[PDB]
Swiss-Prot record, chains A, D, I:
Organism taxonomic ancestry: Bacteria, Bacillati, Actinomycetota, Actinomycetes, Mycobacteriales
Parent-protein start and end of this portion: 59 to 279 of 291
Similarity comment text for this entry: Belongs to the peptidase T1B family.
Native organism: Mycobacterium tuberculosis (strain CDC 1551 / Oshkosh)
Complex and partners: The 20S proteasome core is composed of 14 alpha and 14 beta subunits that assemble into four stacked heptameric rings, resulting in a barrel-shaped structure. The two inner rings, each composed of seven catalytic beta subunits, are sandwiched by two outer rings, each composed of seven alpha subunits. The catalytic chamber with the active sites is on the inside of the barrel. Has a gated structure, the ends of the cylinder being occluded by the N-termini of the alpha-subunits. Is capped by the proteasome-associated ATPase, ARC.
EC number(s) stated in the UniProt entry for this protein: 3.4.25.1
Protein name in UniProt: Proteasome subunit beta
Cell compartment(s), UniProt: Cytoplasm
GO MF: threonine-type endopeptidase activity
Major subcellular site: cytoplasm
GO cellular component: cytoplasm; proteasome core complex, beta-subunit complex
Pathway: Protein degradation; proteasomal Pup-dependent pathway
Means of activity regulation: The formation of the proteasomal ATPase ARC-20S proteasome complex, likely via the docking of the C-termini of ARC into the intersubunit pockets in the alpha-rings, may trigger opening of the gate for substrate entry. Interconversion between the open-gate and close-gate conformations leads to a dynamic regulation of the 20S proteasome proteolysis activity.
Swiss-Prot record, chain E:
GO BP annotations, alphabetical order: modification-dependent protein catabolic process; proteasomal protein catabolic process; proteasome-mediated ubiquitin-dependent protein catabolic process; proteolysis involved in protein catabolic process; symbiont-mediated perturbation of host defenses
Subcellular location: Cytoplasm
UniProt main location, coarse: cytoplasm
Oligomeric form and interacting partners: The 20S proteasome core is composed of 14 alpha and 14 beta subunits that assemble into four stacked heptameric rings, resulting in a barrel-shaped structure. The two inner rings, each composed of seven catalytic beta subunits, are sandwiched by two outer rings, each composed of seven alpha subunits. The catalytic chamber with the active sites is on the inside of the barrel. Has a gated structure, the ends of the cylinder being occluded by the N-termini of the alpha-subunits. Is capped by the proteasome-associated ATPase, ARC (Mpa).
Name of the featured protein: Proteasome subunit alpha
InterPro entries in the cross-refs: Ntn_hydrolases_N (IPR029055), Proteasome_alpha (IPR050115), Proteasome_alpha-type (IPR023332), Proteasome_asu_bac (IPR022296), Proteasome_sua/b (IPR001353)
Family, as annotated: Belongs to the peptidase T1A family.
Function comment: Component of the proteasome core, a large protease complex with broad specificity involved in protein degradation. The M.tuberculosis proteasome is able to cleave oligopeptides not only after hydrophobic but also after basic, acidic and small neutral residues. In complex with the ATPase Mpa, degrades protein targets conjugated to a prokaryotic ubiquitin-like protein (Pup). Among the identified substrates of the M.tuberculosis proteasome are the pupylated FabD, PanB and Mpa proteins.
Keywords: Acetylation, Cytoplasm, Phosphoprotein, Proteasome, Virulence
UniProt GO molecular function: threonine-type endopeptidase activity
Protein encoded by which gene: prcA
Origin species: Mycobacterium tuberculosis (strain ATCC 25618 / H37Rv)
Pathway assignment: Protein degradation; proteasomal Pup-dependent pathway
Length: 216, 215, 214, 216, 215, 216, 217, 213, 216
């Protein structure tokens, strides 16, 4: 399974595939792996539907718990710190990928943030512009490397993210590609100054069809 | 001892009478909270959960401790059950349980009077609920308005006359500020609403420029 | 140790006397609970278990805590043994134990008076049991009716004269609403432990269905 | 052993086989694995008679405990959450399948819900329309895949459920088929807006006898 | 037993202990917050750093407020580490001191003979009016906008300051106004500022030679 | 009454200290000098706390010896957990103030003691000696020149105010101290010790018997 | 409760209990320390060994001082094992008794109606003046250079001893002076006698009973 | 990964590479491993970005916690003692500092390393290195240390040691001229610990490269 | 690594090498392994710089802790007892060698003491006159066995200790010989009636140069 995340001038986009496997058998086709956790953040876990939603839910509760108690939300550094404490607590399994927008950053164009975790539960803020986690991560990263120059805005960001996921599916059987028969496409979240939003399914469908048509 | 019960009750009632006043009233768009508060940091009104709000009068350190404990309870319940489990009735019952235990077991009772308000969920038809929880653990279901702290009677009478069952925001705000002055602007007021038209989090603060516009 | 016992007993008796009244009486189809309650949210009558009901008078926060603890006990027992283990006698004994401990160990005794009622299981012949548990842990087995809260004597006497064993629903309800006055739907909470229900005997009679029975 | 569950317009049906084995030896023929847990839910466990009944009993007690304490039953999301806490608690084994009807859902036709659990104790809402757990699950799922288009109402659904169990038995020795000699047939529960009801043995006997005559 | 007589006698015991100790004043100035205390000792500190932009000042019995200073530093460091350095605010520390003093006043044998002041300045490069909090022996918290006076005789120092105060007064000006008003030398003064112009750690002590030329 | 309790406890302690023998501690050119009226050859009233820190006490023995031991335990733990320079007179005095204040408030009987903690400079450093007086209630006072504890303080305090020299020699300061003490004595009834700032590490040194004779 | 009235009443309760019990004297002599006690019982001991060169003597309520004697032996043996045998001194044991009695006087319901004496002699072949410590019901410790008198009526026995004292009494001499000064406020049938003999290699404590005590008096 | 540290007259310099690997795969290119912990100290861990930053953060909090509580900072010996307690409680760090209380300000630079068992060691050789390219870096410094005469030549040698580590160890990253990523460095003298500007390290790295071609 | 210790008429001497290794690699050249622990004792550990210093520090603190609390230092038997308790506590590693002088012994000429520890944490007082611990201990002991007859005082005793360490280095790669290029030589402590003092570097260097000239 694969989750991708990329920074565009003005924000960040995160997208995940829909498949789950039990060895070689396909166990899921509608698996949602990316969830909005607060007004400015989203988490994605390359794991089961349960691990993804349970993790996001607990994290969302903690961010909102702090906000209600203290009156203001945590700073971006504080959000990562709390996520890291949660990840290290569960490890003592799949690694979280966090996308956010630092509302308090000096330059709004580069305020998008991507945070990933290594096997030991250590956080890492990505300065490369993109990141991917899961079984098709290498194929998705390799694809974004050649297509990143095309990312000039939120629309291009979403298009490239979908193409990276497509390339992951094309080379990794554990990652699901767009199912044109059932009408199931990757899920995505875009985060900018106005907050975190779920990208409409019809928008992802259109992009997927254009990529398929282009490669034919 | 019956003498102990009266002296504790008096100690608490006097502490609440010496503090500033707070009023919350139902309106067409939800519940409105208005409090006399010169401080820009120390909050008397707060969000508890999705559709539930908090308002208190009395000694700060005591009601902030209850505000925190309520948020703690609400978040634990919503996570262990569902978000719809947390209701105004539930939080009010918990505050009644807590204050009642303090009044009985602790050396000094809490010099506070609390108000828990709940609005309907998005797209639902339900009349707003307002609860008054007092220092001894007594809970009262008020259908229209709650007045806590300072001198209750002059503000309560002044509201019994000029109230509107489905007043607009601008109307209900002006009616509330009027009853608080007779017993004050952006620099000395804390205002907030439980807006029943918001998708999930109903609590919204009306501060500064936006409040001066509404005055 | 004798002055303390009297002052605690007085503090509690006065708190119960200042609260609204509740009556519980036996009828043809089970037990009927009628309470004077203007609130639509704060319940004074409740289900404990399958054939067991609860009714209380006094300070709300105190009896709701007892209602919750009783439901906790009942569900634990039924799970650890069998559903038939949970009886009215068992729950009443537990409330007597709890109130007696509160009266003796907490700073203020609970300003409550409780009633635990039990009806027969489906298809069985057994006379309904009603128990009165007071603030000090005293338990009394009442065969016909229980009156708690407010002024007991005027309601108890008005019920002693007008009592019929095996009275009908519409009949027993009217007799109960009558005895409560001497001492409408917007000022009442009514419920029955209907012995004709397969498992859960507790049923609330509210609104439209309640207006008709008067 | 196998449990199947499918959504039909306006509701859900859950059915389970009657066998239990101890290696190769048949240890049970009358094993009830599906139980109504509240007015709108039913659980099924592909394990022994004891694991199935003990689990259902504890869960039924938990749902009713909440209703008595709070006055209203848990929302569907709350019921799953409580089940998940119970499943994760027992792992520290055969996993449950929950069938229920969401009384508060906006569209009553699709208010039927199916919930399963994976090896790690993770919940999952099936969106495919059907699901199966146990040693004959693949066979039952592959059978429902081909017959699902025939499901238009409760009786059509029940037919497809009994046929899925028959196909599981036909290919998996651990799943029991309909015993015409002893008169033992799969048990089933149907849940719609009017609540959860045990399907009469005579309706299942009629369906099973006919699937047999059909393949003859 | 009697909850009202005990409340008055405890309150008197504490008020008298604070009245017998030396005075401390905190006031807003253009570049931050200024702390001036009457302290002949070169070792026993009455003013201290709590966190980045937060300062502490106290009056009363030393062993009691030093215990609170230590506990405040312990709290602040734990919070900043568990959340963000920014979680730590003046409002937060003041709330915690209010909670602690209120519990001491209730549970312990003798209440703390102290009066505390928590002050906070803006972060580097940010526009925010300095916040000053007064926390008393019973747990009462008051948001003072201009100045805080603690210990000894409050009224003569408070009145002498109410007349000579200037909102954007420079360091040299505000220092001279503060030294004056206490009276209502370097060998008897402990002076420190929460300089809002420093990158991270705002607290800075003005001692010896540097304090001389400034006085 | 709580104000009555505070006065009676304070009186009980003040009377116990007034009934015990006197101790003086004074700064001299070479360090700090401790002189105590003690007929006992075994029960010590003056002791070493740390390398540059000394202790002196007046009152009930069992009570101040308990405090001397607790102070040595604290000092050794701190020096080991941090560095040897962490241990200062200010630190130990603060700890004694904390301890005595807790005893006075919570225990049934307050400690009938008055303590003195003194500190000299480290080898080769220029620093004025520090002397701290810690009383029964936890009050701490920074005395620049001398400390007088136990018995009748004023006659000894006045006799010292008139006879105090800033950088007095050993033989000089000793004679001034013994004189001050007589207003409220030889080798057999005196316990004398110095915190000699000229020693490499351990400043504490006892002046007993034959060596104390040549100074008197 | 009033902290001053309680302190006086506890002090009185204890002082009266000690005044009602029989007397014990401990005095230095040329060969060590000598303990003399008025005790009719042949089973219940008032004098005992604590460690190598350390002795114990007490006056007051038996159950209370025997509890302290046992606790002292338990402390002494633990210390000597954890450090060295020379760590256990009279000063150390006296300090511990002072700590214990002081805590009892403060925390327990009734204070201990006892008065204790811890004595220490020199190690074999060493020159050191014997040390005697008096520990009282409140935890007060006093270093007595010549003699200690505990229990009963202190003043008449203390004065009769203050006259008749000698710096280096012989055993036969010091014993007679002690029995005599004890007769101001008795023989083999009513006396408990023991010495801390500084001339014994390790264990200084030795009891002088029956036939051997008769010839000495 | 490699961290180097060396003493120069009147100071200390510490530098670290920017790579992180997951076996044979390059997982990071901008990894900061050296952080200032207080006015006079800096720590460097030859591990992941997280281990380096989390360790430095906890240690910095511990040093400042003491300062606020006691009024004065810990002595250098005390700073090492606290670091040692932290290391034994838990990825072996290299500490670089300047003892402001030392008699000779010229030799006041300090370098402390830790062995596998969590034991501290004060380096008296003048330099030290930790990580997978540490032997290459130490052997390089052995031959170039005679050239260190001040802060600038100290920094050149540190950068050259890291270059040599990268040239022989694939786990240590060399200067990326394409992306403009260079080793990070901290220099500590009597005026405190300061981060070395990226421009100065880039200049030294380009000169080392031109000198080798 | 090697530590030697030998008794001479009037005292004891302890010396240790300066090397530390991480396998075959030389990790240290200035390693101090012998430290003075009190006025009359010194400990040596054949381990890392940290184990040697930390052990000595903890033991020195314990000895001084007792002296401050009780007024007098522990007897020699008590010092060993405390050391043994410390050694047994750490093994539930390298074994410590202790050199000391019993100031209370009857014969001052033989008052020097050497105590070693076996793998099980058991103490042993050496009556052979010398002892060694570490990887080169047997070479050092066999060397001292042939040279011990030459020890007649402190100087000849130091000469024999340095020669023992030289022989240890000559046959064991883990023990460091005198580095004439860097000017690094073994450290040594000499203890007699006047206390424990560190032997000057210049004195060890002259003896080492004489041993090297003698072997050439």
């Amino acid at each position: 399974x694969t989750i991708v995340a990329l920074k565009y001038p003005g924000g960040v986009v995160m997208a995940g595939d829909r498949r789950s496997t039990q060895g070689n058998m396909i166990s899921g086709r509608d698996v949602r792996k990316v969830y909005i956790t607060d007004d400015y953040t989203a988490t994605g876990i390359a794991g089961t539907a349960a691990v993804a939603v349970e993790f996001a839910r607990l994290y969302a509760v903690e961010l909102e718990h702090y906000e209600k108690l203290e009156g203001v939300p945590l700073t971006f550094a504080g959000k990562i710190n709390r996520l890291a404490i949660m990840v290290r607590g569960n490890l003592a399994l799949a690694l979280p990928l966090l996308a956010g927008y630092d509302i308090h950053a000096s330059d709004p164009q580069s305020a998008g943030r991507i945070v990933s975790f290594d096997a030991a539960g250590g956080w890492n803020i990505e300065e490369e512009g993109y990141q991917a986690v899961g079984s098709g991560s290498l194929f998705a990263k390799s694809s974004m490397k050649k297509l990143y120059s095309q990312v000039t805005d939120g629309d291009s960001g979403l298009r490239v993210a979908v193409e990276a996921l497509y390339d992951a599916a094309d080379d990794d059987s554990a990652t699901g590609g767009p199912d044109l028969v059932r009408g199931i496409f990757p899920t995505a979240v875009i985060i900018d100054a106005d907050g975190a939003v779920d990208v409409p399914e019809s928008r992802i469908a259109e992009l997927a069809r254009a990529i398929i048509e282009s490669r034919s | 001892p019956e003498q102990a019960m009266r002296e504790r009750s008096e100690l608490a009632r006097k502490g609440i009478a010496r503090a500033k006043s707070v009023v919350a009233l139902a309106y067409a768009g939800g519940v409105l909270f208005v409090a006399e508060n010169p401080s820009r940091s120390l909050q008397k009104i707060s969000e508890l959960y999705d559709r539930v709000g908090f308002a208190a009068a009395g000694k700060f350190n005591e009601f902030d401790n209850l505000r925190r404990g309520g948020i703690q309870f609400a978040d634990t319940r919503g996570y262990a059950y569902d978000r719809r489990d947390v209701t105004g009735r539930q939080l009010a019952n918990v505050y009644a349980q807590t204050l009642g235990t303090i009044f009985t077991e602790q050396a000094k009772p809490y010099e506070v009077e609390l108000c828990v308000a709940e609005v309907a969920h998005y797209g639902e038809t339900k009349r707003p609920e307002l609860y008054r929880i007092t220092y001894d653990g007594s809970i009262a279901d008020e259908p229209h308005f709650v007045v806590m702290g300072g001198t209750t009677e002059p503000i309560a009478n002044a509201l019994k006359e000029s109230y509107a069952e489905n007043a607009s925001l601008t109307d209900a705000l002006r009616i509330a500020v009027a009853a608080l002055r007779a017993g004050l602007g952006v620099a000395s007021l804390e205002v907030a609403v439980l807006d029943a038209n918001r998708p999930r989090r109903a609590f919204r603060r009306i501060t500064g420029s936006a409040l001066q516009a509404l005055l």
